[PDB]
């Protein structure tokens, strides 16, 4: 289950949010590719809602109305031109599946959904599929709502409708098959996996019925036999019946305990401090590591919502966002998932941003193109995280150095800490109100590396800072409090 299928070598995905298919398989083969990305994850490829008030906003995408591949990313023709660009080279797709549930149950009535196709919630008609009636779980849930009012009680949260969202009756076998028909459709279409959606929502059980119906990866690409890397959103931050765990049969699942406690850790919140990652991992209470999937951020909390509170460290605080994602990276515990966003109008009142629920850059509900800069930036209001040198040099660092084990700790027990993998990765950081200058054990070899953080290695020469190591695996850092980005990496492939 629980391989993410991606080529060797490479050790994380990107999150290309709301991008539209032609963008991604141009991105795969100009730059993924080549800057050894390991996938993409996209949004929703079914049909979804059209919601014009607010204006199309990004969680219009979390509301089905059919299986159909159209929607605002492009039709199936793109989406499966997509796929076999990004296979072609190497890098691998992971659909964002939304099975728990259709679209909101006071939605009107028609045709305003991406493609055209016609339905009625109120009546629960999804003829485009088609769903009736008899499909959703309006005869489980007990509340009065209808919807979820309890997260104490587990039956609740699993048939019961989440904010009015139609809730599928998934025991059913004929539910089953229709949503097995759907992932069948992606997976021979090329797709290597992916994320469920809404798991806490779902019983086990029924994601596991859901499961045994699928074919194995396309035999084009993949290793004969080969299963679709499966990992479920589950949000579960400890105190409620439902557990993370629960979910261990069916793959990985999400941890989102990792970005909470990092984004608490590197502000330095609650008198935590960076001298207590020596034993970061599952000494925290998190998951196994071989069932981890790990991220500071994800497209729902870097908008203030979805759950690890005000530590998130998003874009927005790119100084230490950028520190938060480089210990990521360079720590072995789980696999990785990177962010990739785009920006929208930020308005806070009472602490609450009321312009959180924008969708992408736009014209009239077109979503716009990636465009990128001459300085290999992006243009038209898409952050392209993934693009920036610090990230994108951190995403070869874990390539480098998979596998190796984590050693060479060092920290002054406050926030100066810094640590190797094996003898091919090297890492400072300087989170301190002060100045950083000391000789470390390295564990490399001896020779002249450039540092990937501030600069890149081309070619013989480096673009930024050069740590000079000695016979001995010693090295000196000097890391000023006020640096830009306060911290130093080094690898086996940016040695000169
Ligand atoms: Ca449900
Ligand atoms: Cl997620």
Redesign the pocket.
Known sequence: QYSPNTQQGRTSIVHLFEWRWVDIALECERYLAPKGFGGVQVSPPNENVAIYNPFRPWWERYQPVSYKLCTRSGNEDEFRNMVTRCNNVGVRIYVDAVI??MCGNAVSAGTSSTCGSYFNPGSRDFPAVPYSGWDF?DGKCKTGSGDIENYNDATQV??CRLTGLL??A?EKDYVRSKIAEYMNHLIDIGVAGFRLDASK??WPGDIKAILDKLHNLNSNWFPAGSKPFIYQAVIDLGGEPIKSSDYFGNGRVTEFKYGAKLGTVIRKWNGEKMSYLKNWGEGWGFVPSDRALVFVDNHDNQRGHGAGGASILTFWDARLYKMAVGFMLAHPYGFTRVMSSYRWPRQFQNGNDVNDWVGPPNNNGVIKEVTINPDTTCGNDWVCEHRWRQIRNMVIFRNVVDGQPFTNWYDNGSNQVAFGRGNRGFIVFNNDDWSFSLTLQTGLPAGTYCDVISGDKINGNCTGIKIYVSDDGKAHFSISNSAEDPFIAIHAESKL
């Open positions: 728990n549930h779980n699993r048939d809730d599928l998934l929502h779902m």
